[PDB]
Design a protein around this ligand. Structure first.
Ligand SMILES: *[C@@H]1O[C@H](CO)[C@@H](O[C@@H]2O[C@H](CO)[C@@H](O[C@H]3O[C@H](CO[C@H]4O[C@H](CO)[C@@H](O)[C@H](O[C@H]5O[C@H](CO)[C@@H](O)[C@H](O)[C@@H]5O)[C@@H]4O)[C@@H](O)[C@H](O[C@H]4O[C@H](CO)[C@@H](O)[C@H](O)[C@@H]4O)[C@@H]3O)[C@H](O)[C@H]2NC(C)=O)[C@H](O)[C@H]1NC(C)=O
Ligand code: NAG
Ligand code: NAG
Ligand code: NAG
Ligand code: NAG
Ligand code: NAG
Ligand code: NAG
Ligand code: NAG
Lengths: 57, 13, 360
């Protein structure tokens, strides 16, 4: 079972967000996954949450 | 000019 | 600004896991707002990725993502999530060397020589031969550059040498690859005339090859090109032009023929009779969508300078089967559509369709 979610962060987009190996991608992915994990951990059946994409939208 | 043909599929009724 | 797309994997059902996330969505939103500034109303959770792709990503209906090009190419790729995946709407990815060559030309249009254009076309031929990826941005550029050369050589009465006409054909063969039709379809969504412009540029350039550089024959994989000089021989046999193209999806070769009787050469013979044919052109020359018709034959061209022909016979092989009602048409550059004014059907064999047009 996989559920999707998106949100907009009021900052400036950078092409390093399109590179998963970039430290800028790692800073945002870890920052988002940690807070979402702390919020979704008490949900029954929860397994993992992962940031998979970053866009200029 | 530049020539070719156009063909349509058979439609019953 | 920064759209963050993530996924939540769970062991419950799609409706139960969803409902559980929405009920703590404001507690996850308040945790993320303590690390990053979030836009109001941006937090949207959904359990169905209508479009999901490695190139772009996942998104909902009508979502549109614009991403940059890759290495060597300059521009952007735009796509909108529809019911059938990420449809690319605007792709402006142009090779740097192609764009760099396009930018040297802007300094040459002023003082241009016949030898300068020939070396430019040659530099163009090498760039496409070395990097054969016909991206939509390339297709739009090559069509543009070739048309700027054609219009420059026509407006200067330059002469296309026989090595230069070979380079144009090589360029044509590369961008007329059967693997370029999908990208050609994307280009026509924006520049609905680019395929017609390529055909008009090829035809205009062919008129500039002098009789001294003929006969000349360039039979490639996706385009054939034959040009001959005229002598008192045409008053006797007439003009004949045959092609045999073998695509991969048919074991039978797709044949085409132009027959001009010796009676049509009664007036003062012109100078050169240039003919050419291709199969990919049939798939990139747009047909009316309201009609269920389609190009089921090789696009055949024939150019004679300062000469009007009142009767030309054309023989077209049928590529696809189960199609009926053959319709002899020519490509109208003015109205940008197939047209049947002057062309009538003579006879249809189980294999080829015979046409007869009152104009060439
Ligand atoms: C019709 O258009 C499409 C795009 O709209 C054409 O696809 C383009 O093909 C280009 C060919 O050069 C390619 O250029 C770059 O390709 C290599 C790097 O790309 C990788 O990384 C990309 C991420 O930025 C990624 O998009 C790409 O492929 C992804 O997408 C496919 C499906 O499309 C997936 O199946 C893949 O798994 C992957 O996810 C690659 O992964 C790179 O090697 C190229 O090198 C150029 O520069 C070199 C010198 O630097 C030079 O030596 C060489 O000759 C090249 O010119 C180049 O940087 C585009 O990235 C690609 N477009 C997209 C969106 O991927 C398609 O080819 C065209 N149809 C044709 C030509 O028939
Ligand atoms: C991401 O950046 C690193 C920098 O060390 C680079 O090595 C890597 O190739 C980049 N990713 C891609 C897909 O090029
Ligand atoms: C378009 O490409 C340029 C580089 O060619 C890049 O700087 C820009 O961010 C891209 N635009 C988008 C919306 O990705
Ligand atoms: C001509 O074009 C090439 C690439 O095609 C590039 O070196 C530059 O744009 C030009 N070179 C010159 C004028 O030295
Ligand atoms: C390319 O540049 C000009 C024409 O664009 C030509 O005179 C020159 O010889 C070419 N050189 C190379 C290396 O392609
Ligand atoms: C070339 O001509 C076409 C129209 O004939 C135009 O679209 C284009 O801007 C011209 N110039 C260049 C540099 O492509
Ligand atoms: C070009 O070469 C062909 C041989 O393939 C020849 O028939 C033609 O006359 C040549 N044109 C000139 C004079 O450059
Ligand atoms: C078969 O290949 C030809 C290429 O010459 C193409 O025009 C045609 O659309 C193809 N037809 C099918 C059914 O694949």
């Amino acid at each position: 079972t996989k559920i999707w979610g998106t949100f907009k962060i009021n900052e400036r987009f950078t092409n390093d967000l399109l590179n998963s190996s970039s430290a800028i991608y790692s800073k945002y992915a870890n920052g988002i996954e940690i807070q979402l994990k702390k919020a979704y951990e008490r949900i029954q059946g929860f397994e993992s949450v992962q940031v998979t994409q970053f866009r200029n939208g | 000019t530049s020539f070719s043909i156009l063909m349509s599929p058979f439609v019953p009724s | 600004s920064i759209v963050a797309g993530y996924e939540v994997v769970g062991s419950s059902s799609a409706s139960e896991l969803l409902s559980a996330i929405e009920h703590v969505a404001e507690k996850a939103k308040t945790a993320l707002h303590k690390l990053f500034p979030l836009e109001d109303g941006s937090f949207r959770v959904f359990g169905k990725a209508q479009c999901n792709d490695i190139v772009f990503g996942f998104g909902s209906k009508d979502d549109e993502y614009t991403l940059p090009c890759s290495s060597g190419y300059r521009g952007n790729i735009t796509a909108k999530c529809e019911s059938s995946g990420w449809q690319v709407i605007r792709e402006t990815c142009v090779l740097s060397l192609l764009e760099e060559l396009n930018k040297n030309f802007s300094m040459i249009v002023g003082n241009a020589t016949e030898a300068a254009v020939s070396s430019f076309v040659q530099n163009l031929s090498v760039i496409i031969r070395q990097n054969p990826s016909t991206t939509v941005g390339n297709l739009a550029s090559v069509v543009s550059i070739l048309s700027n050369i054609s219009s420059l050589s026509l407006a200067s009465h330059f002469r296309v040498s026989n090595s230069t006409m070979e380079d144009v054909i090589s360029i044509a063969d590369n961008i007329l690859n059967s693997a370029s039709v999908t990208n050609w379809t994307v280009l026509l969504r924006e520049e609905k005339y680019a395929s017609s412009r390529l055909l008009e540029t090829l035809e205009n350039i062919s008129t500039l090859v002098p009789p001294t550089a003929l006969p000349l024959n360039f039979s490639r994989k996706f385009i054939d090109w034959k040009g001959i000089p005229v002598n008192k021989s045409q008053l006797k046999r007439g003009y004949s032009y045959q092609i045999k193209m073998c695509p991969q999806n048919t074991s039978i070769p797709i044949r085409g023929r132009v027959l001009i009787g010796s009676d049509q050469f009664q007036r003062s013979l012109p100078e050169t009779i240039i003919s050419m044919a291709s199969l990919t052109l049939g798939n990139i020359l747009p047909v009316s969508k309201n009609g269920n018709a389609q190009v089921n034959g090789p696009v055949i061209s024939t150019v004679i300078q300062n000469y009007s022909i009142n009767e030309v016979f054309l023989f077209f092989s049928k590529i696809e089967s189960n199609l009926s009602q053959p319709h002899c048409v020519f490509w109208d550059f003015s109205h940008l559509q197939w047209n049947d004014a002057g062309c009538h059907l003579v006879n249809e064999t189980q294999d080829i369709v015979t046409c007869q047009c009152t104009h060439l």
